[PDB]
Design a protein around this ligand. Structure first.
Ligand SMILES: *Cc1[nH]c(Cc2[nH]cc(CCC(=O)O)c2CC(=O)O)c(CCC(=O)O)c1CC(=O)O
Length: 319
């Protein structure tokens, strides 16, 4: 009767949830939608409300979701990708500059091993240091203190906040390839709740779905997760799916980067697929043709094996 949407009580999480509910309300104007925000402390917590039928769907950043969700849960929707690239926000004293033009030994703030490793490699004159907090906290640390000359953040996050204008530089893949699933939202639901799966299925963007299957199958086959120096770049053009992937030592000195492609046409039409089909890297998309889904998963596995053949595991085990 009433679709309940669970959400973390944080701000980027609530913004993300609201944009999804809004898209669902566009498709289903005749349906009641309710947002329930939950304390994760007391003043997985979301999954607990799902299996307990206290909410019906939960919106996540796709890169925050592990490569295999616990059974009973699935990613029922991969929404159209927002900007996937990493961005730089500069200290007030350094607006108008670039990472090349920052003074040597300027400190750049990031807690992402993927970002630090890639950017140490490409800008040795800089230092990268851990910084903590949500986006508002890191921006207050950048603005009010003199410790950091710049911070690294996901563009997509600054755009959900409406803080576009704090982006000084957007990193091209030759400087910093993005995280698996960066910029795409993922809708987690009960694996067996067919009504809600069909319902959120309207949000699958076929292209984003496939490139995020390729990226997640690549990540899973390297046995990785959110916090590892692995990075990817995908694109679909001319009927081809291009997957570029890389791994880095924490300092960035050891690296492996390779690319493969496969013929995979972006599906136009929706279909009534089988309900018995197993999920792919934690994703369920019965309304999208299964073939391209499986081809995209195969592209991720292949590249991962090629990296593994070149010694990617000994780099990852040390991280
Ligand atoms: C795996 C991982 N998660 C985060 C924190 C995070 N998750 C989502 C976002 C917004 C971007 C999006 O929805 O895709 C963010 C914050 C952000 O990346 O700007 C991180 C980053 C930790 C950090 O200190 O920046 C990561 C690791 C990674 O992205 O490599």
């Amino acid at each position: 009767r009433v679709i309940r949407v669970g959400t973390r009580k944080s701000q980027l999480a609530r913004i993300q949830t609201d944009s999804v509910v809004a898209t669902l309300k566009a498709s289903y104007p005749g349906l009641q939608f309710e947002i329930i925000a939950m304390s994760t402390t007391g003043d997985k917590e979301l999954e607990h409300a799902l299996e307990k039928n206290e909410v019906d769907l939960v919106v996540h950043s796709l890169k925050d979701l592990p490569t295999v969700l616990p059974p009973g849960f699935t990613i029922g929707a991969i929404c159209k990708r927002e900007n996937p690239h990493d961005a730089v926000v500069f200290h007030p004293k350094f607006v108008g500059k670039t990472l090349e033009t920052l003074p040597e030994k300027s400190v750049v703030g990031t807690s992402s091993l993927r970002r630090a490793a890639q950017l140490q490699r490409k800008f040795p004159h800089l230092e990268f240091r851990s910084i903590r907090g949500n986006l508002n906290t890191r921006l207050r640390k950048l603005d009010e203190q003199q410790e950091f000359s710049a911070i690294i953040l996901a563009t997509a996050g600054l755009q959900r906040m409406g803080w576009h204008n704090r982006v000084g530089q957007i990193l091209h893949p030759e400087e910093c390839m993005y995280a698996v699933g960066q910029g795409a939202l993922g809708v987690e639901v009960r694996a067996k709740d067919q009504d809600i799966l069909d319902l959120v299925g309207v949000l699958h963007d076929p292209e984003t779905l496939l490139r995020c299957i390729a990226e997640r199958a690549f990540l899973r086959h390297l046995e990785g997760g959110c916090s590892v120096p692995v990075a990817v770049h995908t694109a679909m053009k001319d009927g081809q799916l291009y997957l570029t992937g890389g791994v880095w030592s924490l300092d960035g000195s050891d690296s492996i980067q390779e690319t493969m492609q496969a013929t995979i046409h972006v599906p136009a039409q929706h279909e009534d697929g089988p309900e018995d089909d197993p999920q792919l890297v934690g994703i369920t998309a019965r309304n999208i043709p299964r073939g391209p889904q499986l081809a995209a998963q195969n592209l991720g596995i292949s590249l991962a094996n090629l990296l593994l053949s070149k010694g990617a595991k000994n780099i990852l085990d040390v991280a």
